[PDB]
Design an enzyme around this catalytic site. Structure first.
Site, PDB file in Angstrom:
ATOM      1  N   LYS B 186      45.168  53.324  48.226  1.00 21.84           N
ATOM      2  CA  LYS B 186      43.987  52.553  48.497  1.00 21.84           C
ATOM      3  C   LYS B 186      44.045  51.912  49.882  1.00 21.84           C
ATOM      4  O   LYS B 186      44.801  50.953  50.075  1.00 21.84           O
ATOM      5  CB  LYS B 186      43.746  51.439  47.459  1.00 21.84           C
ATOM      6  CG  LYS B 186      42.373  50.817  47.655  1.00 21.84           C
ATOM      7  CD  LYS B 186      42.208  49.503  46.933  1.00 21.84           C
ATOM      8  CE  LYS B 186      42.417  48.352  47.866  1.00 21.84           C
ATOM      9  NZ  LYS B 186      41.311  48.191  48.865  1.00 21.84           N
ATOM     10  N   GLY B 239      50.605  43.411  52.657  1.00 26.68           N
ATOM     11  CA  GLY B 239      49.499  42.474  52.752  1.00 26.68           C
ATOM     12  C   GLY B 239      49.962  41.065  52.483  1.00 26.68           C
ATOM     13  O   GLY B 239      51.141  40.734  52.714  1.00 26.68           O
ATOM     14  N   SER B 240      49.034  40.250  51.974  1.00 32.00           N
ATOM     15  CA  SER B 240      49.262  38.800  51.780  1.00 32.00           C
ATOM     16  C   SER B 240      50.280  38.531  50.694  1.00 32.00           C
ATOM     17  O   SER B 240      50.259  39.193  49.644  1.00 32.00           O
ATOM     18  CB  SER B 240      47.976  38.091  51.379  1.00 32.00           C
ATOM     19  OG  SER B 240      47.555  38.457  50.089  1.00 32.00           O
ATOM     20  N   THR B 241      51.173  37.583  50.976  1.00 33.06           N
ATOM     21  CA  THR B 241      52.047  36.980  49.988  1.00 33.06           C
ATOM     22  C   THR B 241      51.364  36.709  48.623  1.00 33.06           C
ATOM     23  O   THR B 241      51.893  37.108  47.594  1.00 33.06           O
ATOM     24  CB  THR B 241      52.690  35.710  50.567  1.00 33.06           C
ATOM     25  OG1 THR B 241      53.476  36.056  51.730  1.00 33.06           O
ATOM     26  CG2 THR B 241      53.601  35.049  49.542  1.00 33.06           C
ATOM     27  N   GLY B 244      50.839  40.044  46.838  1.00 29.69           N
ATOM     28  CA  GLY B 244      52.162  40.549  46.536  1.00 29.69           C
ATOM     29  C   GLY B 244      52.802  39.894  45.327  1.00 29.69           C
ATOM     30  O   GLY B 244      53.409  40.566  44.475  1.00 29.69           O
ATOM     31  N   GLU B 261      55.908  44.548  51.520  1.00 25.05           N
ATOM     32  CA  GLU B 261      55.971  44.071  52.927  1.00 25.05           C
ATOM     33  C   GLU B 261      54.899  43.012  53.138  1.00 25.05           C
ATOM     34  O   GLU B 261      53.703  43.324  53.142  1.00 25.05           O
ATOM     35  CB  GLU B 261      55.732  45.188  53.942  1.00 25.05           C
ATOM     36  CG  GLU B 261      56.643  46.383  53.868  1.00 25.05           C
ATOM     37  CD  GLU B 261      57.868  46.260  54.757  1.00 25.05           C
ATOM     38  OE1 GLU B 261      58.002  45.261  55.505  1.00 25.05           O
ATOM     39  OE2 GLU B 261      58.704  47.179  54.679  1.00 25.05           O
ATOM     40  N   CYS B 295      52.217  41.068  61.223  1.00 26.04           N
ATOM     41  CA  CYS B 295      53.134  40.258  60.434  1.00 26.04           C
ATOM     42  C   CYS B 295      54.425  39.886  61.139  1.00 26.04           C
ATOM     43  O   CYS B 295      54.971  38.799  60.904  1.00 26.04           O
ATOM     44  CB  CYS B 295      53.417  40.962  59.123  1.00 26.04           C
ATOM     45  SG  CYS B 295      52.089  40.485  57.989  1.00 26.04           S
ATOM     46  N   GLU B 392      51.579  31.504  58.245  1.00 27.16           N
ATOM     47  CA  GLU B 392      51.030  32.664  58.951  1.00 27.16           C
ATOM     48  C   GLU B 392      49.543  32.485  59.196  1.00 27.16           C
ATOM     49  O   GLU B 392      48.737  32.432  58.268  1.00 27.16           O
ATOM     50  CB  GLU B 392      51.261  33.965  58.169  1.00 27.16           C
ATOM     51  CG  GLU B 392      50.815  35.191  58.930  1.00 27.16           C
ATOM     52  CD  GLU B 392      51.300  36.474  58.317  1.00 27.16           C
ATOM     53  OE1 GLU B 392      50.982  36.740  57.117  1.00 27.16           O
ATOM     54  OE2 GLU B 392      52.002  37.222  59.048  1.00 27.16           O
TER      55      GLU B 392
END
Ligand SMILES: NC(=O)c1ccc[n+]([C@@H]2O[C@H](COP(=O)([O-])OP(=O)(O)OC[C@H]3O[C@@H](n4cnc5c(N)ncnc54)[C@H](O)[C@@H]3O)[C@@H](O)[C@H]2O)c1
Ligand SMILES: NC(=O)c1ccc[n+]([C@@H]2O[C@H](COP(=O)([O-])OP(=O)(O)OC[C@H]3O[C@@H](n4cnc5c(N)ncnc54)[C@H](O)[C@@H]3O)[C@@H](O)[C@H]2O)c1
Ligand code: NA
Lengths: 488, 489, 491, 491
Positions: B186, B239-241, B244, B261, B295, B392
């Site tokens: 995706k 992507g975003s924490t 994740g 990641e 990142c 971030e």
């Protein structure tokens, strides 16, 4: 008869091992450990609470960031681990007695398997401390590129009760070899053996806080470890349900997890098996360690031509096992680890009867006291029955006819588990064709239940994530750093 | 920059999904829009993958894995497929870089020189691995043959973000494909176009039906259907924490291997004996590369006190001089943020930086009249607890912090939940290797910054992720180790 | 002030020293013996059983039978490993015994034999005990019709010949890796220094090595060594010594298509660039040549100094040389001992004469020392040119040549203009220059801001005429292996 | 039925065949030439430029310069990889041209040259291009005071000599691994079969190889070969061919302490056990020897059969041998072509006469075939003993020896009682017996229930006097590498 160092140990309350020191729980709590052959209390143990896990973790963080463990050479670190191995070997009889008393398995198999496996393990991993190599990567002439395999830091380790000391080594050998420090929680049923071995860590010369042992309960000591902000990585062996929780919780902190969980492993007797060898393989495969073994071959598939023969042999052997206390010389099979475990396997037996299965042998409690269950053989079973899908964890085997190789691969594979498998066949192509097609971490071709420090162990699917043992195990305790040096 | 005919033709129709080797619409005809972030205009209308479509993709991927060409094929044949794909991507380099410039927002020239060529190189690199994914033969006893097989884990679900769209698809698929997995991928709703154009090229290279399935859509539907699918064997996300965490949590129910990641707050550290010229440039480019939507961006620039005023002055000037414009304008050095949502988020961080007492030495506002642009920004007078030095931002925002000792800067650089990358600038041989050894980051550049290559692994320590991508390392995430014991007694 | 003899070395030295064949202590079949001396005093230190061809022969049959069948052939890898580890413990337990013997037989100072040679030996065996369970082959994915895998089999009976300058450590370099692989061994120590090894034979027995796994056959190069080199039933040969003897070995091995590993001499450059930390580099330079009396193949016999620093390092090197305390290795105050033999003493004094004849300046030393013993003074050669005999050829003594240079590209070329390429040192504080220079030097080992470092885990060997192959690390295992590629049809 | 010549091979053969030095097509400095033949018709197929000692010296300078400076030395691994893949694509583009050259020049059938040889050449280059980016060294965690790392540096200019039986594929075996690592190459093709390689030189140029990275010097072994072998500035030498020439090369290499790898001959055994699948084993035994007319070092020239099946397999091989269709490589019906030269035919015909006078029975063949060409009939020898010349020595034609056996222990011994150890075949349906036997055979490659399988990913080489070293797989990379251990002092 009890060895004197074991009598001395069991004569005082059992202490935790934190920061090189034997200590009580900060708030003074204790719990009882029992002998499953007798149902008596064997020891009273200091019970780790959340604040104890926080002391253990501070001690581990500190030993890692500064001091001798952090300054030592890989040769020096290796020597420590080798010396521990020697010490465990010197105390082999004392540890074997403790596993026999606390877990319940026969003394002689604790000595010949558990203690010798533990010793070989540390010896093996002591050899890796000097050989954990990273890379030099040729990319450009403008850059030196390399990787360091650094130790992840403080690790949280939770282990079960069915091979207490072996499993402490599976965990600590690999982690210690990379240079990590350790907070480990043994199972509430079987803490003694690890807590005796602490003395041997002290005596081998392990700096303070390199290892820390915090016995207690899963929802308190256990969960303290899994939720701690300063534990870098977690390794767990146990049930699938606790497994799922640890991973859920580990997600809050993006913590690497390695899970070793349950199984419903198939052991498969094809038409050209050596039948006499496969029968013993099938029987030992389920009955070893009272069936309290993740990799147990609890689904014996037999080609149709040999079904009635192997079943007759498995019934005879089931009734022939010698049930008794682990500390009796003549015992071949001990009891279940607890009352709750015996109740559980007995409820699985009742479920199998009520679902239509036939007990051809066993199927009930054994003896006057202790948590014993007679070795059990189930016939007239279907794949959709509860007893054939779920991990029972007692000495209970299900025996299933099949007519084709393609059929049995599909039925072996139709499972949520995929930890181990056995295949019995004299033919060279068939052996490796079947091995290739089974969704299982370990495949034994004409054998069953073999483990070695050098060979990786772990599951496919819901049997786990990751591998322990071998070179592969080191990877879990490592963190890879890619360095680029401009030399342009 | 004149649009290529093939790009013109591609944008002129509805953008199809790629499932089982065919270009398709969503089963129920749903669609969504992708924008040009420089103008705010609708760029294309794309078919939107629903739960049902992810289901069709997984069945196709399952079938391609269990039987057929992909399953039977030699490693040499698979390697050749992956290599043919790289050649095709290279042939269409200009088309792809335009779509990356139109859809994501970066400058054409950098998408060409950096993104496209790194996509080519990563596939090229992983086609070489198919034939060399080896297991072991273990000597234990004369009574057994012991060996391990590294079997591909199976159908793999991959989700990527929007900041390096094509390159990131190659970070996920190169290693997966090289092991013999099949794939349901995706792309980000903001940037589906590159990957769906690229789909033409998997078909033309000869990929069998279903080896690769591309399902554009939204995270809460297409993404969530991937995460929660019982028949996907292994999941990989970047992507975003926050997303994740969710994914690892959901993956616990199927005891499913995860690679993550996630973000960073990477330090770029300038010690007293840096070559200051080269470190100022490395510091500037470290944060500003890709508009700071990186990142690994060197968002905390630590500078030894002796050099502090000098590099602040130089970063302010350089910040004030970057030429903002559309990615398709040849003069443009920096483009905009990917979306209105992201511009709003980075502007919010700027305000939170002002509320907390920090000073904006440069930029600190939106730019231009159309577009999700934000001016390059330098923060000064900062402390370690402030939200802008901790979180971030993902914008062209930098934080400059002085320090007085090496041990002190190591402690401050490491006090982060993040640990993705770090930069160290020193002419000393001991200090360079010492500092790099002590920093808790996946990658450390000594006298350089933002260097990636197919062969060197990439990933975070702590909350920056789990696992590595690129290199030999990434193979291991798509593998399932089988230990076989053959009694030869 | 003498280091007092250990009771166990005294007992050992009182009897003829026997050989070790097929787990038994034996005299030579024909009864020949040879003498070994104490190079500090020149007196006879021991009388040793001397191996002839017929004795080498018995050792090979013993090795062959232990490899083809019996306990060593049936043992698990963990069992083998345990053996090697117990051996390391026994060597550590007799550390003082062994170190007195190196000091006596070889000549080096007792303290360094203890701290360095003995502990390196122990460390080496412990490292390789760890490889035993880890010598892994491959599983190659080629096609779904086959199962392709490799086995790294031990090559078989190995012939090992070692020199005299680090006698026990060198025995570990050879045997560690070979035993780790499952090979069996016939090993000839140097006629100058057999004692250390033949004492260690006790410990291989006490550790429980099966008979024949390990066989020690002391004696002379043209007899015992040549009989190893030429034996039809030795599968592989490993040698460390002079370039002349190395060529003979490689040439003789041609006739049996035998894999050969060679570790030969060197003329290793030690390079002090302009941005060296000078205090450190001066000690590296002095220690790089003077360690083990310059009887060290990796020795920084050429000290290249950037011109800014040339006068400074020469003065420091002269003051230091003149200050080393020469004497007997069993004497406590001794820093540098003697050369191993009269023959070697003549060799180095002779290179010193050729240095003076060619025009160079003796800045320090340049002659024998003391009243007896094979001693030569630490020597500093100044006013040297790259074409001189002394700068080209390995001297093997405590002799150093100092050469100024004006640029980095120049010193790289001058360092590299050699047939040798065993090692090199670079001294520079700059991150780029260190690695740039290290990448461009043609040497098996490069130390950046250091010199003469060895460890079990890091490979060692030469480029060009300094050798073929590597020793130490994992790389060493490959020399003792034989790769087998097995294809299993599973169509 | 004649296979029709490709326009491009017509154009190529219509001219004098040139050498390839430093990126250009050249003549020999002195202008000498030699002829190559069509071994089917015995006519002159081409006139080729003959490399002399002086031409090898030009080729070596160009390779040396290409190694030290210029694009090849500055290129990234990704770039080197891309040259090797583009070559592989060009070869595949020219597959028919090259297979016809093998068929004309070597004699083998076109279709098999295409299906096997050319396709393997391509796959070999493709596999080695994948290695350029993944030749990794180690970072070795020893102590906190050092960073220890190793570099696998290309060894430099390498000299490569190959034989005539698999001309193009063997050139790829040598070059893929050597180029993968960053070496440069002086390669000499066999005098009998220079054509396919010098055609392939068009493809190195078209692919963009910098000048000098690859140099091809056709010629005679005792002039052009020896010039490579004896050249002071070649860093490493690789060779495949006769035991005799291989001993020469190793002997000569000793003088320069130059690494040698050797792929030499074999008398490989192919063992039918009692529980073999006999259909398969019979085809395996037959193909195992007859493939490529027996001009195959790994050929199953000793077929061992359990006594239960001895008569069944002897009868089947006799029928298959009498049915092979001999003819020109470029005729469609051809199943087996001729031997390479008149000399090769005379050597194999000599061995057959030797078999007859030692007392063995020719159950089929035993003599020359056809009117023109260097053909020899497929031969089956029976009533043979272990001590016979024909069962010991490599014949290198379509000549098999059938030997019965009674026990498994016995066949392992008789199969290993040979100075050779290149390959072996074992046919058994039993899982245990397959691996046990494969473990006990002293051979580089063992096939279980198949024969003669090779692949770029699986190493190939000999045990004992069949060779030193391996080719193919990752294992081949180590031969062109020089390991450098860096130690960086970090306080
Ligand atoms: N994979 C294995 O080797 C293994 C071992 C034991 C049991 N099992 C399975 O588990 C079943 C039940 O056994 P159990 O309930 O005693 O084992 P369990 O899953 O509860 O795990 C045992 C270990 O985990 C700890 N634990 C329990 N709850 C925890 C929590 N919330 N947080 C952290 N740690 C926690 C326990 O204290 C102990 O150390 C068995 O029937 C069997 O199927 C598997
Ligand atoms: N290992 C193999 O695959 C292989 C290949 C061909 C031949 N052989 C064996 O060798 C026999 C035939 O001998 P041959 O005619 O191949 O001779 P050969 O082995 O000498 O020729 C092989 C290669 O070496 C070269 N060569 C020959 N003498 C040389 C020298 N002094 N210096 C350098 N190079 C030299 C040749 O030109 C040719 O390129 C066969 O019958 C067979 O047993 C083995
Ligand atoms: Na002596």
């Amino acid at each position: 008869e009890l060895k004197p160092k074991v009598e001395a140990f069991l004569n005082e309350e059992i202490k935790m091992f934190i920061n090189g020191e034997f200590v009580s729980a900060i708030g003074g709590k204790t719990f009882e450990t029992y002998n499953p052959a007798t149902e008596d209390v064997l020891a009273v143990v200091c019970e780790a609470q959340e604040e104890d896990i926080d002391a253990a973790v501070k001690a581990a963080r500190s030993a890692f960031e500064s001091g001798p463990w952090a300054e030592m050479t890989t040769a020096e670190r290796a020597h420590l681990i080798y010396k521990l191995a020697d010490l465990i070997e010197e105390h082999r009889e004392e540890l074997a007695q403790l596993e026999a008393l606390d877990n319940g398995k026969p003394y002689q198999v604790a000595l010949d398997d558990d203690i010798s496996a533990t010793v070989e393990n540390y010896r093996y991993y002591a050899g890796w401390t000097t050989k954990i190599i990273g890379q030099t990567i040729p990319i450009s002439k403008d850059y030196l590129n390399y990787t360091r395999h650094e130790p992840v830091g403080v690790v949280g380790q939770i282990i079960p009760w069915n091979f207490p000391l072996v499993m402490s080594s599976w965990k600590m050998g690999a982690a210690l070899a990379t240079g990590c420090t350790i907070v480990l929680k043994p199972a509430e049923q079987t803490p003694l053996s690890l807590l005796y071995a602490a003395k041997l860590f002290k005596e081998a010369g392990f700096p303070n806080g390199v290892v820390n042992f915090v016995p207690g309960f899963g929802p308190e000591a256990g969960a303290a470890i899994v939720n701690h902000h300063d534990i870098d990585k977690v390794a767990f062996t146990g049930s699938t349900v606790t497994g799922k929780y640890i991973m859920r919780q580990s997600a809050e902190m993006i913590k690497h997890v390695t899970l070793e969980l349950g199984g419903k492993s198939p052991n498969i007797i094809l038409e050209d098996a050596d039948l006499e060898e496969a029968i013993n393989g099938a029987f030992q495969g389920i009955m070893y360690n009272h069936g309290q073994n993740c990799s147990a071959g609890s689904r014996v598939f037999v080609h149709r031509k040999h079904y009635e023969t192997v079943v007759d042999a498995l019934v005879k052997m089931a009734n022939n096992v010698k049930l008794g206390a682990g500390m009796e010389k003549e015992t071949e099979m001990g009891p279940l680890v607890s009352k709750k475990q015996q109740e559980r396997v007995l409820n699985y037996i009742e479920q199998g009867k009520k679902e239509g299965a036939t007990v051809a042998a066993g199927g009930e409690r054994a003896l006057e006291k202790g948590y014993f269950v007679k070795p059990t053989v189930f016939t007239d079973v279907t794949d959709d029955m509860t007893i054939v899908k779920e991990e029972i964890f007692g000495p209970v085997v299900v025996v299933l006819p099949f007519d084709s190789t393609e059929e049995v691969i599909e039925r072996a594979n139709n499972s949520s588990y995929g930890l181990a498998a056995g295949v019995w066949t004299q033919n060279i192509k068939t052996g490796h064709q079947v091995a290739n097609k089974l969704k299982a971490g370990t495949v034994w071709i004409n054998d069953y239940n073999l483990e070695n420090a050098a060979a990786p162990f772990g599951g496919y699917k819901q049997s786990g994530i990751g591998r322990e043992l071998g070179s592969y195990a080191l990877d879990n305790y490592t963190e890879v750093k890619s360095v680029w040096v401009n030399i342009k």
